[PDB]
Amino acid sequence: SMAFPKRLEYGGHALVWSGDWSAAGARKAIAGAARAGYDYIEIALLDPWQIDVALTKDLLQEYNLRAHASLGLSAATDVTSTDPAIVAKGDELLRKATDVLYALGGSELCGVIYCALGKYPGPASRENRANSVAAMQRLADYAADKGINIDLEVVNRYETNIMNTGLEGLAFLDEVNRPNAFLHLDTYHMNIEENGMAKSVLAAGDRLGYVHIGESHRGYLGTGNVDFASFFAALKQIDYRGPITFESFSSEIVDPKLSNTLCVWRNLWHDSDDLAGKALEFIKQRY
Amino acid sequence: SMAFPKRLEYGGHALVWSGDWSAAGARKAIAGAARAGYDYIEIALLDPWQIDVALTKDLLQEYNLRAHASLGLSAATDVTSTDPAIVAKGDELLRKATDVLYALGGSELCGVIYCALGKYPGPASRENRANSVAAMQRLADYAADKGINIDLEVVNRYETNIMNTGLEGLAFLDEVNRPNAFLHLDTYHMNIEENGMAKSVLAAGDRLGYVHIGESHRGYLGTGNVDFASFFAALKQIDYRGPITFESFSSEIVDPKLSNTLCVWRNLWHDSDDLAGKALEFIKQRY
Numbered sequence A, B: 001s002m003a004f005p006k007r008l009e010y011g012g013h014a015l016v017w018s019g020d021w022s023a024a025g026a027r028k029a030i031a032g033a034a035r036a037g038y039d040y041i042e043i044a045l046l047d048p049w050q051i052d053v054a055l056t057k058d059l060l061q062e063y064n065l066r067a068h069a070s071l072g073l074s075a076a077t078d079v080t081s082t083d084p085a086i087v088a089k090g091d092e093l094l095r096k097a098t099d100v101l102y103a104l105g106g107s108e109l110c111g112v113i114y115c116a117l118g119k120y121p122g123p124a125s126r127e128n129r130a131n132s133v134a135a136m137q138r139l140a141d142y143a144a145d146k147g148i149n150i151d152l153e154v155v156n157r158y159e160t161n162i163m164n165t166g167l168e169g170l171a172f173l174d175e176v177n178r179p180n181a182f183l184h185l186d187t188y189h190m191n192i193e194e195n196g197m198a199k200s201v202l203a204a205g206d207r208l209g210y211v212h213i214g215e216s217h218r219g220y221l222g223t224g225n226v227d228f229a230s231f232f233a234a235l236k237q238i239d240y241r242g243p244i245t246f247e248s249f250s251s252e253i254v255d256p257k258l259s260n261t262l263c264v265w266r267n268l269w270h271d272s273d274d275l276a277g278k279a280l281e282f283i284k285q286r287y
């Protein structure tokens, strides 16, 4: 068991272009990501059964584009649950997601894979956390057979009760104790929870395996409150060489299964291409 | 008719010291605010029927302290509801809170007074917004007879679907069209939703009636990401002369119902006096 190769590469989140993964939606997102000049598309596998693999393989080939995958779990698939029937549903979704990612020749399963994405009605018990750590052990081991790293995305208090800072994320990963399990940081969530935009990156070092770039309000990069200068300087200091996906959500493009959960009440952009294009330039200028 | 006098004065949120307003909790919080050097205490009126008003007035006299009030409504008192019985409950609580604030000699009712504080399942309908605007018209007119201004606190996407930016708040206040209705900004909520920390303040000018100071993670002022230098520069430029309350919420002090609502999963402070004391020094040094 070991970590699978990572490279400095730039990706666009599928929801920048498409709210579904129909033949049309898949192509819109892949074509968009390719058009803006990204190395990969990040597919939202919130329902990995809805994904036509052959179709997707063909599109990625057609546009000379690589794929990674992210998801959140839901109440019905929450691996922190003290109901083992719900944890089993979680393990199953995570296996299927991995199977799909393997069929597409992808190497990264990231996002909120360790709990239900959304507002918890109270703080996590030690048992909620232990349930989550075990589930990520079973996932990392399943993934390892298929040349896939998992990257646990730290998100803000409103989207998980398990880990809200990189430091918390790192301590969680110590317990997972798997070589193909990494920290996933997102500048949007960091903007809320972190003591500056450097502390968690510098602590993480080689354990930082994935990055999401989002503005404070998840709109155009450079129109919000995120100190990107301080963040990217930290990446340079640890010489980060892994996926970097631009992520943004507008009511304009809505997945029913994500948009209400992320409380995307506001339209912060309408031109996917203009947003994605400016974002990659903004990112590449700094890293 | 008219708006009531505002002065530049510094406030401590009662919830920094006490989770309740028992005689002991009230005494503790008022003595705390006075000890830290604040001009007033901001009393949480989530349940204004549970306040002993004569006791509170005696305490405020005893410690030579003024009082303003903030609250959030809940599902059962949501003035945005399409259930007129629920709106009626909201009107009733808002009237009661105004009565309490009036008897206490206060002039400012602020916070999430226009909707239920928390995660909405979907975006706000035209009805939801119109119901809210009408409720704030009835409240503003009721408060006008009692020399009280109302200030509508703009909160982040996870805490309301009605208004997430200062600009949205100003537009909502245009429809309310009451001289004693003002905008209320909170740096914690601005840190997520705003295009920088100056814009909403410069646009609001004389319509900014109330300010909450919160760090990005709601911990010690200056250990987070909020560009306070840029915010206070904006306050200076419009010569803001209104209440400035420091707030933060510890799961060790507040009611489990509120800490769960605000997703306080960790505590970045334990010493109420040290936090509140240092918070005021931080504020008074910049404004």
Ligand SMILES: O=C(CO)[C@H](O)[C@H](O)[C@H](O)CO
Pocket (backbone or CB within 6 Å): A013, A044, A070, A071, A072, A110, A111, A112, A117, A153, A155, A159, A186, A212, A247, A258, A262
């Ligand atoms: O930031 C996120 C949600 O706020 C993550 O990117 C999600 O886990 C991922 O996009 C799943 O949609």
Ligand SMILES: O=C(CO)[C@H](O)[C@H](O)[C@H](O)CO
Pocket (backbone or CB within 6 Å): B044, B070, B071, B072, B111, B112, B117, B153, B155, B159, B186, B212, B247, B262
């Ligand atoms: O920022 C706030 C909520 O997060 C407001 O201060 C509260 O809604 C209000 O003070 C009630 O406690």
Ligand SMILES: [Mn+2]
Pocket (backbone or CB within 6 Å): A153, A186, A212, A247
């Ligand atoms: Mn993300």
Ligand SMILES: [Mn+2]
Pocket (backbone or CB within 6 Å): B153, B186, B212, B247
């Ligand atoms: Mn506030």
